[model samples]
Target: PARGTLLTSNFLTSYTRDAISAMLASPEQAKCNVRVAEFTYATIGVEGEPATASGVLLIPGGERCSGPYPLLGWGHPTEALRAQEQAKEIRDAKGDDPLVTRLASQGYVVVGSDYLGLGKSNYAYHPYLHSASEASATIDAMRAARSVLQHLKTPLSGKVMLSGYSQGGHTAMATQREIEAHLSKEFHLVASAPISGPYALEQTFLDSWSGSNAVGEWTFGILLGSYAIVAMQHTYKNIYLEPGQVFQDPWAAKVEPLFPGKQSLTDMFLNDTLPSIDKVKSYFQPGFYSDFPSNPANPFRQDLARNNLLEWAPQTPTLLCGSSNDATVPLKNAQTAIASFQQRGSNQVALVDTGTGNASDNSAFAHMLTKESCIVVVRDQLLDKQR
Candidate 1:
């Protein structure tokens, strides 16, 4: 399949400054007019095979902005596999994200990917934090957006900024890597900011459960790990033959069906009974917990190593943002990437602490802080002049 090939396009929605302001309930956020649409394009699979991915793109719809605008490839944080999110509709396709909204408010063309399995794409089960899957799917969406801009005869400055939070942060880094490497023929990445991602996938999550999680403590430890294990098992067969292999008793039987199904992690977290540090011993099956240290090759452990984003250096201007108090993604992932780049004598990369709180994966910006506080801090950093 030819890369960046546009499969189909449709107008999804449009919103003006007043409408966005009302939706966000923030008068200050009322910005420019934007047009939203859905587009699908050829993307790479989890194994680098050919597949198609889709996403929603927002373009300036009002005359207040003239000519082409710089493109921003925006990635979203962790989310459940909800139909409202995975559909072609723009109603809730991350348009309200503080970063995306702030950037679009400033007159930038922003494209948001539905990821691998999130959209109408036939791909089964989203690869989640898998680097290649994120990069290929996002970059392909960006490419298709550029094509749409051309078809409308709208000019483009050709400058690009890649950014995301949490899961998106990881993918954004991988996407930046993709653009600078294989897709250099088509796009140039001027800047990027990956916020609070599990770059050290294995080391990050495992260390959190073991003890310190960023600057604070984990919200719900054991149950969270249980969700991850289930997802991983589905993604990599070698991880487990059955849910019972990792989970104990009725709990295992309870959560297994939700993975790859329509249920979101948030739902399981609330409705189901899960374990914590106190009940840890009884929560997991025998070898699933105790023997992991002795058996580094455990399927789950191995998959963790494969998903890490710290191996490569960022070749473009980049910023890694996270919280020392972040309980969800933790701060080590961001610090890990920064330290790796520093060891290589690369100053192009730096770390910004969004502060010591608000690590919720569902938040658009500083779910722990005020919008003006968290959003403005990042907005000022990515400042590229002229609206």
Candidate 2:
């Protein structure tokens, strides 16, 4: 899709401070009312062809604030953008999404994409970790949201920032590259905070398998392997001779369909035999997972290397935020990106470790703590400039 590719939007849902508080931590700090919309826009596909995409937009109502609101391009982690059965297309919905609510309360317009291939614009497949598709999905979604605001008689402050976690985290950085460099004619990046993503995909993915496989994180490494293969196969034709090259027995054929459909993580994890409980490495092909680090030129390693986000430098202020103990997405992701940016002669990137991110705090997922940490971080960052 070319630039300014938004066609139109329709109402999806709405929320109140009371509703936002239901899932939020600090309602006492509520800033505005909330509304929801569905944004469908055009984007470029892997083949360099124009494609349509859609995502939910969570908007804050005006009251104490005047003029226009700052904007945020919110990219979501893997699970949030996963394909749900027939949910490959728009689902006509918006989310309270505690983070977006908090964002609106603090007075900012937040636009989030389910990315391409998911939600109402469900394409045959989503280019999971592909940087270009991810960036196009987000950049176009922001444009759609701006149109939605114009329709509502609202103006924008022209201060757009990018934020996302996990896969979304990698996407935040990827979008950082697109908007700050490629799309500066349309939008400028004020700041970005991408938390806990596989910025250095190959190294980090191999590290996850070697070290306890972080089996503690429900073997997310295994899940990532499955998703990564699906992505490579979907985008890069003939990347795999057969599923057996990437997966073991039955799963070689089964995993791909499972993800591009309605299968839930539970359906894939608990209901399936892929994760292989305690053994960890059993989930992957015999030598595939075990041999990756020793053999860097392997196809899988090459795919991971292609999407490496830390390889470049940014011209804007960006922070790679995450928890050092996060197993779902290794904290090394943040450290690696910061180091890479520094090597490229750019001091604009920084790291903000939220905590050890060990679920020691009776937490189900410590990686998530960074989400709230970033919300608050961006709030102050945005308000600091507003003042």
| Residue 285 lDDT in candidate 1 | 83
lDDT of each: 0.69, 0.69
TM per candidate: 0.87, 0.88
* C-alpha positional error of residue 284 in candidate 1 after TM-score superposition, expressed in Å: 2.1
Q: What TM-score does candidate 2 get on C-alpha atoms?
A: 0.88
Residue-by-residue lDDT tens digits, candidate 1, 308-376:
877766778777776655666766677778887777767778777766444443222232343234345
Highest lDDT model number = 2
- The runs of at least 3 residues in candidate 1 whose Cα sits more than 4 Å from the true structure, single-residue gaps closed, are 21-31, 86-100, 211-214, 220-224, 273-278, 356-375, 383-387
Clashing pairs in 1: 215-324
Q: Over the full model, what C-alpha lDDT does candidate 1 score relative to the true structure?
A: 0.69
Q: lDDT tens digits, residues 1-387, model 2? A: 474477667765566656556546533455676766666777767787877777666667756556577788887777523543111222232334545456766667778887778776646787888888888888888887787788787767788888887888888888898777777767867778786777887767776665343324435456666777787778875347777876777677777876556665556666653654355555567777767778878776777788888777788787677776676776777777788889998898777766754456322266667776766765566434542
